[PDB]
Amino acid sequence: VNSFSGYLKLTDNVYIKNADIVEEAKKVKPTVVVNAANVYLKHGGGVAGALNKATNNAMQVESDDYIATNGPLKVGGSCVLSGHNLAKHCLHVVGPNVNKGEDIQLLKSAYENFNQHEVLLAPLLSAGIFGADPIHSLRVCVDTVRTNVYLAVFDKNLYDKLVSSFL
Ligand SMILES: O=C(O)C[C@@H]1CN(c2ncnc3[nH]c4ccccc4c23)CCO1
Q1: How many CB atoms lie within 10 A of CB 135?
Q2: Which residue has the CA at smallest separation from atom 14 of ligand 1?
Q3: How far is residue 133's CA from residue 94's CA, in Å, rounded to a whole number?
Q4: Measured from the CB, is residue 158 less than 6 Å from ligand 1?
Q5: How far is the CA of 114 from the centre of ligand 1 (A)?
Q6: Cβ atoms of residues 119 and 147 within 8 Å
Q7: What is the spatial distance between Cα 119 and Cα 121, in angstroms, rounded to a whole number?
Q8: Distance (Å, whole) CA 11 – CA 29
Q9: Domains of the chain in sequence order
Q10: How far apart (Å, rounded) are the C-alpha atoms in residues 25 and 104?
Protein backbone atom coordinates (compact mmCIF):
# COMPACT_ATOMS: atom_id res chain seq x y z
CA VAL A 1 0.00 0.00 0.00
CA ASN A 2 1.24 3.53 -0.84
CA SER A 3 0.00 7.11 -0.44
CA PHE A 4 -0.86 7.94 -4.06
CA SER A 5 -4.56 8.91 -4.30
CA GLY A 6 -7.12 9.39 -7.08
CA TYR A 7 -5.20 7.58 -9.85
CA LEU A 8 -6.79 5.54 -12.59
CA LYS A 9 -5.16 2.13 -12.96
CA LEU A 10 -4.06 1.49 -16.57
CA THR A 11 -2.12 -1.77 -16.09
CA ASP A 12 -0.65 -3.96 -13.36
CA ASN A 13 2.02 -1.30 -12.70
CA VAL A 14 1.03 1.99 -14.40
CA TYR A 15 -1.36 4.56 -12.90
CA ILE A 16 -2.42 7.98 -14.23
CA LYS A 17 -3.97 11.16 -12.81
CA ASN A 18 -4.81 14.68 -13.97
CA ALA A 19 -2.52 16.54 -11.59
CA ASP A 20 0.21 19.16 -11.30
CA ILE A 21 3.33 17.10 -10.60
CA VAL A 22 4.66 19.89 -8.36
CA GLU A 23 1.55 19.83 -6.17
CA GLU A 24 1.47 16.04 -6.20
CA ALA A 25 5.11 15.83 -5.10
CA LYS A 26 4.53 18.38 -2.32
CA LYS A 27 1.67 16.29 -0.96
CA VAL A 28 3.00 12.75 -1.32
CA LYS A 29 6.74 13.42 -0.79
CA PRO A 30 7.50 10.33 -2.92
CA THR A 31 10.80 8.51 -2.72
CA VAL A 32 11.40 9.45 -6.38
CA VAL A 33 10.04 12.27 -8.54
CA VAL A 34 11.07 12.21 -12.20
CA ASN A 35 12.15 15.42 -13.92
CA ALA A 36 11.78 15.96 -17.67
CA ALA A 37 15.40 17.05 -17.95
CA ASN A 38 17.69 18.09 -20.79
CA VAL A 39 21.32 17.00 -21.11
CA TYR A 40 22.60 20.25 -19.55
CA LEU A 41 20.18 20.07 -16.59
CA LYS A 42 19.06 23.61 -17.49
CA HIS A 43 15.63 23.67 -15.85
CA GLY A 44 14.09 26.55 -17.75
CA GLY A 45 10.55 25.56 -18.60
CA GLY A 46 8.01 22.81 -18.85
CA VAL A 47 8.05 20.30 -16.02
CA ALA A 48 11.70 21.06 -15.23
CA GLY A 49 11.16 24.79 -14.88
CA ALA A 50 8.18 24.15 -12.64
CA LEU A 51 9.97 21.65 -10.37
CA ASN A 52 13.02 23.89 -10.09
CA LYS A 53 10.89 26.95 -9.24
CA ALA A 54 9.21 24.95 -6.46
CA THR A 55 12.69 24.27 -4.96
CA ASN A 56 13.50 28.02 -4.96
CA ASN A 57 16.26 27.30 -7.56
CA ALA A 58 18.08 24.80 -5.29
CA MET A 59 17.59 22.12 -7.96
CA GLN A 60 19.39 24.33 -10.50
CA VAL A 61 22.26 25.10 -8.10
CA GLU A 62 22.79 21.39 -7.42
CA SER A 63 22.47 20.59 -11.13
CA ASP A 64 25.09 23.16 -12.15
CA ASP A 65 27.58 21.55 -9.77
CA TYR A 66 26.70 18.10 -11.18
CA ILE A 67 27.36 19.26 -14.75
CA ALA A 68 30.58 21.05 -13.82
CA THR A 69 31.88 17.77 -12.37
CA ASN A 70 30.44 15.18 -14.77
CA GLY A 71 29.55 16.93 -18.02
CA PRO A 72 26.23 16.57 -19.84
CA LEU A 73 23.92 13.60 -19.70
CA LYS A 74 23.14 11.47 -22.75
CA VAL A 75 19.78 11.70 -24.51
CA GLY A 76 18.00 8.65 -23.08
CA GLY A 77 20.10 8.84 -19.90
CA SER A 78 19.52 9.95 -16.33
CA CYS A 79 21.06 10.89 -13.02
CA VAL A 80 19.81 10.75 -9.43
CA LEU A 81 20.03 14.00 -7.47
CA SER A 82 18.27 15.40 -4.42
CA GLY A 83 14.51 15.76 -4.38
CA HIS A 84 14.87 18.89 -2.21
CA ASN A 85 11.49 19.81 -0.67
CA LEU A 86 9.57 17.71 -3.22
CA ALA A 87 10.77 14.10 -2.79
CA LYS A 88 13.64 12.12 -1.33
CA HIS A 89 15.31 11.91 -4.76
CA CYS A 90 14.83 13.44 -8.18
CA LEU A 91 15.54 11.16 -11.15
CA HIS A 92 16.48 13.56 -13.96
CA VAL A 93 15.62 11.70 -17.19
CA VAL A 94 16.39 13.02 -20.68
CA GLY A 95 13.75 12.10 -23.24
CA PRO A 96 14.42 12.98 -26.88
CA ASN A 97 13.34 16.52 -27.79
CA VAL A 98 11.57 16.38 -31.16
CA ASN A 99 12.01 20.15 -31.46
CA LYS A 100 15.77 19.43 -31.55
CA GLY A 101 15.49 16.57 -34.07
CA GLU A 102 16.39 13.81 -31.61
CA ASP A 103 15.55 10.19 -32.40
CA ILE A 104 12.20 9.15 -30.89
CA GLN A 105 13.46 5.59 -30.54
CA LEU A 106 15.49 6.99 -27.63
CA LEU A 107 12.22 7.35 -25.74
CA LYS A 108 12.31 3.65 -24.80
CA SER A 109 15.86 4.01 -23.46
CA ALA A 110 14.72 7.02 -21.42
CA TYR A 111 11.88 5.06 -19.80
CA GLU A 112 14.22 2.15 -19.00
CA ASN A 113 15.78 4.38 -16.32
CA PHE A 114 12.52 4.10 -14.36
CA ASN A 115 13.13 0.35 -13.85
CA GLN A 116 15.95 1.14 -11.40
CA HIS A 117 13.34 2.48 -8.91
CA GLU A 118 10.54 0.46 -7.34
CA VAL A 119 8.03 3.36 -7.22
CA LEU A 120 8.08 6.74 -9.02
CA LEU A 121 5.97 9.85 -9.54
CA ALA A 122 6.60 10.97 -13.11
CA PRO A 123 5.49 13.01 -16.14
CA LEU A 124 5.14 11.57 -19.62
CA LEU A 125 8.63 11.70 -21.10
CA SER A 126 9.16 13.79 -24.24
CA ALA A 127 5.63 15.28 -23.93
CA GLY A 128 4.83 18.97 -23.62
CA ILE A 129 7.60 21.24 -24.89
CA PHE A 130 9.72 18.21 -25.87
CA GLY A 131 7.38 17.81 -28.84
CA ALA A 132 6.49 14.11 -28.89
CA ASP A 133 2.98 12.69 -29.11
CA PRO A 134 1.88 12.04 -25.49
CA ILE A 135 -0.27 9.07 -26.59
CA HIS A 136 2.89 7.47 -27.98
CA SER A 137 4.82 8.34 -24.83
CA LEU A 138 2.18 6.61 -22.69
CA ARG A 139 2.35 3.51 -24.89
CA VAL A 140 6.15 3.34 -24.59
CA CYS A 141 5.86 3.85 -20.83
CA VAL A 142 3.42 0.96 -20.42
CA ASP A 143 5.49 -1.31 -22.67
CA THR A 144 8.85 -0.44 -21.03
CA VAL A 145 8.42 0.36 -17.33
CA ARG A 146 7.95 -2.68 -15.09
CA THR A 147 8.19 -0.87 -11.74
CA ASN A 148 5.28 1.05 -10.24
CA VAL A 149 4.81 4.40 -11.95
CA TYR A 150 2.31 7.13 -11.05
CA LEU A 151 1.93 9.48 -14.03
CA ALA A 152 0.84 13.07 -13.48
CA VAL A 153 -0.69 14.80 -16.52
CA PHE A 154 -1.09 18.56 -16.07
CA ASP A 155 -3.59 19.20 -18.87
CA LYS A 156 -7.11 17.91 -18.17
CA ASN A 157 -8.01 17.79 -21.87
CA LEU A 158 -4.94 15.68 -22.62
CA TYR A 159 -5.56 13.45 -19.60
CA ASP A 160 -9.06 12.62 -20.86
CA LYS A 161 -7.72 11.90 -24.35
CA LEU A 162 -4.98 9.62 -22.96
CA VAL A 163 -7.50 7.60 -20.94
CA SER A 164 -10.15 7.42 -23.66
CA SER A 165 -7.65 6.26 -26.31
CA PHE A 166 -5.73 3.79 -24.11
CA LEU A 167 -5.58 0.25 -25.44
O1 LIG B 1 1.13 16.32 -19.23
C2 LIG B 1 0.98 17.24 -20.07
O3 LIG B 1 -0.14 17.41 -20.62
C4 LIG B 1 2.13 18.17 -20.43
C5 LIG B 1 3.50 17.50 -20.48
C6 LIG B 1 4.00 17.21 -19.07
N7 LIG B 1 4.41 18.38 -18.35
C8 LIG B 1 3.91 18.49 -16.97
N9 LIG B 1 3.49 17.33 -16.46
C10 LIG B 1 3.00 17.21 -15.25
N11 LIG B 1 2.93 18.25 -14.47
C12 LIG B 1 3.35 19.46 -14.88
N13 LIG B 1 3.35 20.61 -14.21
C14 LIG B 1 3.84 21.60 -14.96
C15 LIG B 1 4.01 22.95 -14.64
C16 LIG B 1 4.54 23.83 -15.58
C17 LIG B 1 4.90 23.34 -16.82
C18 LIG B 1 4.73 22.00 -17.12
C19 LIG B 1 4.19 21.08 -16.19
C20 LIG B 1 3.87 19.66 -16.16
C21 LIG B 1 4.53 19.54 -19.14
C22 LIG B 1 5.15 19.24 -20.50
O23 LIG B 1 4.40 18.30 -21.25
Answers
A1: 15
A2: 47
A3: 16
A4: yes
A5: 18
A6: yes
A7: 7
A8: 23
A9: 8-165 (3.40.220.10)
A10: 28
Å from CA of 2 to ligand 1 middle: 23
| Cβ of 19 less than 6 Å from ligand 1 | no
Q: Which DSSP state fits 166?
A: -
In 3-state terms the chain splits into helix, strand, coil percentages (rounded to 5) of 40, 20, 40
Q: How was this structure determined?
A: X-ray
Documented resolution in Å:
1.0
Does 129 contact ligand 1 (Cβ within 6 A)? yes
Give the H/E segment covering residue 164. helix 156-164
Ligand 1, atom 13, residue with closest C-alpha: 20
Q: How distant, in Å, are the alpha carbons of 17, 56, 89, 96, 140 from that of 52?
A: 21, 7, 13, 20, 26
Query: Whole-angstrom Cα distance, residue 6 to residue 126?
Result: 24
In whole angstroms, give the CA distance from residue 123 to residue 49.
Answer: 13
